[PDB]
Amino acid sequence: PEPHAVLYVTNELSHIVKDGFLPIWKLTGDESLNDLWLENGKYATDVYAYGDVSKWTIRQLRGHGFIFISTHKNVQLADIIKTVDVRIPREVARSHDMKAFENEIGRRRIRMRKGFGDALRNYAFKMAIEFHGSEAETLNDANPRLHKIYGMPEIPPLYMEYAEIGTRFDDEPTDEKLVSMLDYIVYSAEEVHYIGCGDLRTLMQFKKRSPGRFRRVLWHVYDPIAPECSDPNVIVHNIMVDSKKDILKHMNFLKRVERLFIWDVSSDEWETTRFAEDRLGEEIAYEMGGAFSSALIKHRIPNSKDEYHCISTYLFPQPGADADMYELRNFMRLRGYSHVDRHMHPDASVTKVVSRDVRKMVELYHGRDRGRFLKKRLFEHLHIVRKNGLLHESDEPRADLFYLTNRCNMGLEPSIYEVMKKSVIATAWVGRAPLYDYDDFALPRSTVMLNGSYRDIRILDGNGAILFLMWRYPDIVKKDLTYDPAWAMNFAVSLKEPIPDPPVPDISLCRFIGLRVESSVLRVRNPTDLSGHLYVTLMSGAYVTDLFWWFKMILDWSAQNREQKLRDLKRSAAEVIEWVRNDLIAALREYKRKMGMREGASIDSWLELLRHL
Ligand SMILES: Nc1nc2c(ncn2[C@@H]2O[C@H](COP(=O)(O)OP(=O)(O)OP(=O)(O)OC[C@H]3O[C@@H](n4cnc5c(=O)[nH]c(N)nc54)[C@H](O)[C@@H]3O)[C@@H](O)[C@H]2O)c(=O)[nH]1
Ligand SMILES: Nc1nc2[nH]cnc2c(=O)[nH]1
Ligand SMILES: Nc1nc2[nH]cnc2c(=O)[nH]1
C-alpha cells in the first residue's frame, strides 16, 4: 500500500532510467547512514536509484527495499558480493528502450515472488510438522515420511457413486500420458509394483525428468518384454502376471513400508479381453488390499456396454492423453500401511459406471494440448489430507502459509489470530494495493501489530522476517537469496520465536521507511518524538513490526549507553539504519481514543503491560 522497492541499477544501465515516469534517487556514495533513511523515506512509489553503494551491507540494502538490476551477474558490497536480482539481457538494453527494460523488470519480479515463499517454507520444514492450506509446491518439498501435509485443494473431475461433472476449465499441454501418470501417483510410496512396464522409456524418462522421487522408491517392474536395468532400485521382472502369487513372493513382510500398485496391461474379433484385463489388474490389487495403500489401475472404457461394474475408489481422465484416447485410470485407495492418511478417500469398492457419463468425461478433459492443471489437482487431491486450518486442532507444531487471508475465510478474523498466536510460522496479506495475481484481502496493520505480537510470537512484515531469518538462521536463509522486498512487505509474518537477549534494535525489526512522509500525511487528513513515533506506526498502518520486542528494546536496552551498547550489537551480529514508559502509554490511549470498538482490546492488554512490566 505504501511500501516500495528501490530499483537499483548499475552505471552502464543508468542513462535510460532518466526517461521513464517514475522518480529517480541519485547517489553519490557519501551519503552518511541517515541520508538513505530520509531520502529513501521520500519516495511513496517504487524508485530507481544509481551510484556508488560500496560501503553498505546487504541487509542494510534490503531493509531499504533494494532490487539489483544490471548487465552484470553481481555487484560489489561491503557485506559480500551479491548475485544480481534482475539481469538485463545484453541486446535488451541497448538499444535503450525504456519500456522493454521496465517490462523486463516486472516479469522476473513475479518470477521473484517464489523466492520469498521459499525461504519461508524452507524454514518451516526446518521447524513444523503439520502444514495447512497446502498445495503441490508444499507437497513438492515435503518429506512424506515426516511432514504431514493438509489443506482443501480444488478437486479434479472424478467418477464414482456419484458424478456431478464437470465442469470445464482452461488447461495446458503436459508430460506425455503415461509419464504424467507416474507424475501424480508417485508421492509417498516407498515400493512400487508396476505391472506392464514395457520398453521402459516411460519409467526411464521419469528418472531423467524428476530423479529424486524416482530414487527414493523401490521398483518392481513386471513384463515379458521389459529390458535389463543397471539402476539398483529397479528389480526387473520378466514373468507375465495372472495372479497375486507373482507379486507376493517379492515383498519383505518383516518391514512395514508403503507399497503402490500400478497396473497397465494390454495384450495383442472383439475385446472382452481388454476388459477382464483391467478387472484382473484390479482383482489382484483387491486381494492385496492389506499391503498396498494404493492402486493406479488402467481402465479402458468398453464399446459394447451401456453400463458396467468394477471395484474403484475414483475414476479419472489422464493428463496429456490424446483426445480420442478413451481410457481413464482408476484409483483405489486401500487399507495397508501409508505415510499419508487417505481414509477420507473412500475405501475402494464396487461401482456401477454409465459408459456415456464416462464418455463425456474424456470429452471435456482429454486432449494432447491439455492436462497440466488436471495433473496438479489429481496429484494435490491424492496426497494432501483434506482438512481445514482455521478449524483444525493440532497436537504437534504447524505451519500456516499463504492461505489464511484467502477470500473464502472472509470475516472469520478471530480464528485467524488464534492461529497466528500459536503457529510456528503463518502469514497474512496486508497490502492495500489493486493488486493483480493475488486474491486475498488484508488486515489492518495496527490490528495485526497488536493482536499478533506475543511473548513467544514474533510479528514482522515479510521483509522484516526475511531479514530476521537471515540474521538468526543464516543457513536457512542465505544473505544472497534473491527476493523482492516490496512484495515481501505485502505480507504479515508470525514466528514462534524468542525475543533476543539482548533486544538489540536490528533492521529485521527497526526499518520504518518514510515515517516522516507518513507522519505529515496523518496530520493533514486526520490530525490530533518517541512518544508520537509510536502513534504514527499505528495510525499509518503502513507498518507491521514486533511491538513487544521493539518495546523491550527501548526500556531494557536504549538507553543504557552509547559505550556499553555496541558492544552488544557487534557481537549479536546485528545491524541498524537510524542512528519513557509514560510516553508510550499515552500513544496507546490516544490511539484507541481515536478508535473505540474498531479495536483492539488491547491496547488495554498492552497498556496494562507497561503499567506492570
Ligand atoms: N501393445 C498393444 N497395446 C494395445 C493394443 N490394443 C490396445 N492397446 C492399448 O490401448 C491403449 C489405448 O488405445 P487407443 O486409445 O488408441 O484406443 P483403445 O484401445 O480404446 O482402442 P480399441 O478399443 O482397442 O480399438 C477400437 C477403436 O474404438 C475407437 N472408439 C471410438 N469411440 C470410442 C469410445 O467411445 N470408447 C472406446 N473405448 N473406443 C472408441 C477407438 O478410437 C479405437 O481406435 C493403448 O495405449 C495401448 O496401451 C495392442 O494390440 N497392442
Ligand atoms: N511470495 C509467494 N511465493 C509463493 N510460492 C508459492 N506460492 C506463493 C505465493 O503466493 N507468494
Ligand atoms: N504431479 C505433479 N504435479 C505438479 N504440479 C506442479 N509440480 C508438480 C509435481 O512435481 N508433480
Q: How far apart are CA 193 and CA 325, in angstroms?
A: 25
Domain-ending residue, one of 489, 514, 539: 514
Which residues fall within 8 angstroms of residue 311, CB to CB, at 6 or more apart? 282, 283, 286, 332, 348, 349, 350, 351
223 and 316: one domain? yes
100 and 141: one domain? no
Where residue 573 sits, what CATH number does that domain have?
1.20.1280.200
The count of other CB atoms within 10 Å of the CB of residue 389 is 26
Q: Are 425 and 574 in contact (CB under 8 A)?
A: no
Please work out whether the CB of residue 133 comes within 6 Å of at least one atom of ligand 2.
no
334 and 436: one domain? no
Please work out whether the CB of residue 206 comes within 6 Å of at least one atom of ligand 2.
no
- Whether cis (ω within 30° of 0) applies to the bond prior to 284 is no
Identify which ligand lies nearest to the alpha carbon of 180: 3
Q: How far apart are CA 378 and CA 328, in angstroms?
A: 13
Nearest ligand 3 atom to alpha carbon 379: 1
Torsion of CA 412, 413, 417, 418, to 10 degrees: -30
- Ligand 3 pocket test, pick from 376, 377, 382 with the greatest ligand atom count within 8 Å of Cβ, gives 376
530 and 467: one domain? no
Q: Report the pocket of ligand 1 as residue ranges, CB < 6 Å.
A: 266, 268, 271, 274, 300-301, 303, 324-327, 359
Q: After which residues is the chain broken (C to N over 2.5 A)?
A: 268, 528, 579
212 and 257: one domain? yes
Give bridge partners of residue 460 from the DSSP assignment: 493
Place of cell 514486533: 546
Domain-ending residue, one of 416, 449, 484: 416
Expressed as residue numbers, the domain containing 359 is: 128-416
Residue nearest to atom 9 of ligand 1 (CA): 266
The count of other CB atoms within 10 Å of the CB of residue 502 is 18
Please work out whether the CB of residue 322 comes within 6 Å of at least one atom of ligand 2.
no
293 and 398: one domain? yes
Q: Are 479 and 58 in contact (CB under 8 A)?
A: yes
At residue 296, φ and ψ (nearest 5 deg) are -110, 80
**CA 343 to each of CA 90, 114, 179, 337: distance values in angstroms, whole numbers, following the listed order:** 55, 32, 27, 12
Q: Are 479 and 445 in contact (CB under 8 A)?
A: no
234 and 366: one domain? yes
Where residue 151 sits, what CATH number does that domain have?
3.40.50.150
Question: Resolution, rounded to a tenth of an Å?
Answer: 3.4
Tell which residue, 142, 205, 118, 186, has the closest CA to residue 378: 186
**CA–centroid distance, residue 117 to ligand 2 (Å):** 5
Angle at CA of residue 206, ends 301 and 125, nearest 5°: 110
189 and 178: one domain? yes
Q: How far apart are CA 29 and CA 220, in angstroms?
A: 65
Tell which residue, 567, 512, 561, has the closest CA to residue 540: 512
Please work out whether the CB of residue 113 comes within 6 Å of at least one atom of ligand 2.
yes
> In terms of DSSP H, where are the helices of 395-484?
413-420, 445-452, 462-472
412 and 424: one domain? no
**CA 224 to each of CA 239, 240, 431: distance values in angstroms, whole numbers, following the listed order:** 6, 6, 60
Domain-ending residue, one of 365, 382, 416: 416
Q: How much of the chain is in helix, strand and coil states, percent to nearest 5?
A: 35, 15, 50
- Whether cis (ω within 30° of 0) applies to the bond prior to 415 is no
**CA–centroid distance, residue 239 to ligand 3 (Å):** 32
**CA–centroid distance, residue 593 to ligand 1 (Å):** 75
**If you count them, how many residues does the chain have?**
613
Please work out whether the CB of residue 117 comes within 6 Å of at least one atom of ligand 2.
yes
Angle at CA of residue 227, ends 223 and 229, nearest 5°: 110
**CA 59 to each of CA 66, 502, 577: distance values in angstroms, whole numbers, following the listed order:** 10, 19, 10
Q: How far apart are CA 503 and CA 324, in angstroms?
A: 66
Map 72-124 to HEC letters.
CCEEECCCCEEECCEECCCCCCCCCCHHHHHHHHHHHHHHHHHHHHHHHHHHH
**CA–centroid distance, residue 317 to ligand 1 (Å):** 15
Q: Are 99 and 503 in contact (CB under 8 A)?
A: no
- Whether cis (ω within 30° of 0) applies to the bond prior to 335 is no
**CA–centroid distance, residue 402 to ligand 2 (Å):** 7
Q: DSSP of 120-166, one letter per residue?
A: HHHHHTTT-SEE-S--HHHHHT--TTT-EEEE-PPPPP-BSS-----
Residues 240-246: contacts with CB within 8 Å, 24+ apart? 241/195, 241/265, 241/284, 242/280, 243/284, 244/284, 244/287, 244/288, 246/222
At residue 551, φ and ψ (nearest 5 deg) are -40, -70
**CA–centroid distance, residue 137 to ligand 2 (Å):** 9
115 and 164: one domain? no
The count of other CB atoms within 10 Å of the CB of residue 537 is 24
381 and 499: one domain? no
Q: DSSP of 165-209, one letter per residue?
A: --------B-S-HHHHHHHHH-SS-SEEEEE--TTSHHHHHHHHH
157 and 249: one domain? yes
**CA–centroid distance, residue 406 to ligand 2 (Å):** 13
Residue nearest to atom 3 of ligand 3 (CA): 376
- Method in brief: X-ray
Give bridge partners of residue 425 from the DSSP assignment: 399, 495
Q: How far apart are CA 606 and CA 215, in angstroms?
A: 53
Q: Report the pocket of ligand 3 as residue ranges, CB < 6 Å.
A: 136, 140, 183-184, 375-376, 379
At residue 274, φ and ψ (nearest 5 deg) are -35, -45
Give bridge partners of residue 149 from the DSSP assignment: 131
Number of domains making up the chain? 3
Tell which residue, 530, 545, 546, 523, has the closest CA to residue 586: 530
Please work out whether the CB of residue 402 comes within 6 Å of at least one atom of ligand 2.
yes
Tell which residue, 425, 402, 327, 322, has the closest CA to residue 366: 322
**CA–centroid distance, residue 271 to ligand 1 (Å):** 10
Q: How far apart are CA 574 and CA 202, in angstroms?
A: 53
Which three cell numbers mark 15?
542513462
Nearest ligand 2 atom to alpha carbon 462: 1
Q: Are 319 and 168 in contact (CB under 8 A)?
A: no
Tell which residue, 14, 80, 47, has the closest CA to residue 478: 80
**CA–centroid distance, residue 438 to ligand 2 (Å):** 9
Map 264-307 to HEC letters.
CCCCCCCCHHHHHHHHHHHHHHHHCCCCEEEEEEEEECCCCCCE
Residue nearest to atom 14 of ligand 1 (CA): 325
